[PDB]
């Protein structure tokens, strides 16, 4: 048998704000965080907009000297991680430090640091490569730097499962706690891919919306005029905690993480199967894991990337798993507002799934002006919908056909 896992701390950088409550405010108001990218010549690029983190002050978290050593994606992860730990009220001690671990991931990692260090390599030669290039860029340095700053001696690792990173990180952090390997984990993901390599790289695959004239309308999941995902930066971190540990210190419990599902499509490198067979298996795995019937699910935070084939696979998958319950659950894409934070998408959308539970409100899918063929589910078009939510799912579907599902329940 198995220990129960609750959420006692949440932290976030998003295109909607510098913390969870500002972000959540934007979500329920249907605000877009998408805009032309600044301080950067995108003249030769077919996409010139995305979700940037606006006004981020790393010196709230690190000295200028330590921040200079770390890629933006690491700064973002640390910000969310430090917010999440502070939000939890947890005190690290000699008595508990070996029971507190970290799993903060990234899908794409340190492109900004790779670009600057390439610029030096090609222009001047290898002698201008930063000494901090490697430890300042490697994906596991959010877990590493967090563990060093706070003295965490529990499981220390990082997932990289592309657009599924955040979902997987949180789920496998929850298994560490459930199976007694840890009492507390900081888990989630961070990403800064709004640079030339990210816009360029995704641009070259024609994966990105090129709607440069109306950036706020670019991300339009399940809408017949969608033309690919919007690329976005940020981080999400949760403090996961064994229930008895949380109750003993009198922790505030936002929700219970009751279920985690993983699956592989074994289909295509970037395209999901049309019927979403992988996403269906993954969601069924998560519900079986939670001991729940599909009928008990009230809210789904969709992957909902605004890609032609991705959005319609998730409709198929939901209809397949949920049968005659499929129209009764509400399902929304907060990527309609935030765009796609890649590896951090699962982390911030777990937070939105938890806050949907706390506030009894389904976040909207904005821009859903003209649902596409078969997109006839309750996709919460345009406006937030207050409703009953006991159980919320969060899905992520990534490149290589890697799937993640998290199941959260109201706690009382």
Longest C-alpha distance within the chain, in Å? 64
Give the shortest CB-112-to-ligand GX4 separation in angstroms. Answer: 10
Closer CB to a second copy, residue 186 or residue 380?
186
**Whose structure tokens read 């971190």?**
237
Closer CB to a second copy, residue 154 or residue 363?
154
| Binding string, residues 63-92; x marks residues near ligand GX4 by CB under 6 A | ------------------------------
Closer CB to a second copy, residue 146 or residue 379?
146
Burial tier of 70 (Cβ tally within 10 Å: 0-12, 13-18, 19+) = buried
What backbone phi and psi angles, to 5 degrees, belong to 153? -120, 0
* Partner touching 374 among ligand GX4, a second copy, none, CB below 5 to 8 Å by kind: none
Spatial separation of the C-alpha atoms in residues 345 and 395, rounded to whole Å: 10
401 binds ligand GX4 (CB under 6 A): no
Residue 165 host element (H or E): helix 165-178
From the list 17, 128, 144, the residue with the least C-alpha distance to 71 is: 144
Closer CB to a second copy, residue 158 or residue 407?
158
- Contact between residue 168 and residue 409 where contact means Cβ atoms under 8 Å apart: no
What backbone phi and psi angles, to 5 degrees, belong to 131? -60, -25
* Partner touching 96 among ligand GX4, a second copy, none, CB below 5 to 8 Å by kind: none
Closer CB to a second copy, residue 146 or residue 362?
146
Task: Classify the C-alpha dihedral 308-313-318-319 as positive or negative.
Answer: positive
Closer CB to ligand GX4, residue 56 or residue 399?
399
Give the shortest CB-216-to-a second copy separation in angstroms. Answer: 24
Give the shortest CB-89-to-a second copy separation in angstroms. Answer: 20
Closer CB to ligand GX4, residue 133 or residue 408?
133
Q: Which of 132, 175, 309, 411 binds ligand GX4 (CB under 6 A)?
A: 132
* Partner touching 140 among ligand GX4, a second copy, none, CB below 5 to 8 Å by kind: a second copy
* Partner touching 353 among ligand GX4, a second copy, none, CB below 5 to 8 Å by kind: none
Q: Which of 12, 13, 72, 108 binds ligand GX4 (CB under 6 A)?
A: 108
Closer CB to a second copy, residue 19 or residue 289?
289
* Partner touching 148 among ligand GX4, a second copy, none, CB below 5 to 8 Å by kind: a second copy
Task: Classify the C-alpha dihedral 362-52-46-213 as positive or negative.
Answer: positive
From the list 240, 237, 283, the residue with the least C-alpha distance to 260 is: 283
105 binds ligand GX4 (CB under 6 A): no
Give the shortest CB-101-to-a second copy separation in angstroms. Answer: 7
Closer CB to ligand GX4, residue 137 or residue 190?
137
Q: What is the full DSSP assignment across 185-224?
A: EEEEEEE---SHHHHHHHHHTT-B---TT-HHHH--TTBT
Spatial separation of the C-alpha atoms in residues 115 and 47, rounded to whole Å: 18
From the list 334, 302, 307, the residue with the least C-alpha distance to 318 is: 302
Spatial separation of the C-alpha atoms in residues 147 and 141, rounded to whole Å: 9
Give the shortest CB-24-to-ligand GX4 separation in angstroms. Answer: 29
Burial tier of 24 (Cβ tally within 10 Å: 0-12, 13-18, 19+) = buried
Site for ligand GX4 in 354-373 (CB under 6 A): none
Site for ligand GX4 in 173-202 (CB under 6 A): 202
Give the shortest CB-133-to-ligand GX4 separation in angstroms. Answer: 6
Binding site for ligand GX4 (CB under 6 A): 108-111, 114, 131-132, 134-135, 137-139, 202, 205, 207, 270
């Amino acid at each position: 048998s198995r220990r129960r896992v609750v959420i006692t701390g949440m932290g976030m950088l998003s295109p909607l704000g510098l913390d969870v409550p500002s972000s959540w405010e934007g979500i329920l108001a249907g605000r877009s965080g998408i805009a032309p990218i600044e301080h950067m010549d995108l003249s030769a690029y077919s996409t010139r907009f995305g979700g940037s983190v606006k006004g981020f002050n790393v010196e709230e978290y690190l000295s200028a000297k330590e921040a200079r050593k770390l890629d933006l994606f690491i700064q973002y992860g640390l910000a969310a991680s430090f917010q999440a730990v502070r939000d939890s009220g947890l005190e690290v001690t000699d008595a508990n430090r070996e029971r507190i671990g970290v799993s903060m991931g990234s899908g794409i990692g340190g492109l900004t640091n790779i670009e600057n260090n390439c610029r030096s390599l090609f222009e001047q030669g290898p002698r201008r490569i930063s000494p901090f290039f490697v430890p300042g860029s490697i994906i596991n340095m959010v877990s590493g730097f967090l563990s060093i700053h706070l003295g965490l001696q529990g499981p220390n690792y990082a997932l990289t499962t592309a657009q599924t990173t955040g979902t997987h990180s949180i789920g496998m952090a929850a298994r560490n706690i459930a199976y007694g390997e840890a009492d507390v984990m900081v888990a989630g993901g961070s990403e800064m891919a709004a640079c030339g390599l990210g816009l360029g790289g995704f641009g070259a695959a024609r994966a990105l919306s090129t709607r440069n004239d109306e950036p706020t309308r670019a991300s339009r999941p399940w809408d017949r005029d969608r033309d690919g995902f919007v690329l976005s930066d940020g981080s999400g971190a949760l403090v996961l905690e064994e229930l008895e540990h949380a109750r003993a210190r009198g922790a505030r419990i936002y929700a219970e993480l009751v279920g985690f599902g993983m699956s592989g499509d074994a289909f295509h490198m970037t395209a999901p199967p049309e019927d979403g067979a992988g996403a269906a298996r993954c969601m069924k795995n998560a519900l079986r894991d939670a001991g729940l019937d599909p009928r008990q699910v009230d809210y789904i935070n969709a992957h909902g990337t605004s890609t032609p084939a991705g959005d319609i696979a998730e409709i198929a998958a939901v209809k397949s798993v949920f049968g005659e319950h499929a129209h009764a659950l509400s399902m929304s894409s907060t990527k309609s507002m935030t765009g796609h934070l890649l590896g951090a998408a699962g982390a911030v959308e777990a937070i939105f799934s938890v806050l949907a539970l706390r506030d009894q409100v389904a976040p909207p899918t904005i821009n859903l002006d003209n649902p596409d063929e078969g997109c006839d589910l309750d996709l919460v078009a345009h406006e937030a919908k207050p409703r009953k939510i006991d159980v919320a799912l969060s899905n992520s579907f990534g490149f290589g056909g890697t799937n993640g599902t998290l199941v959260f329940r109201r706690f009382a």
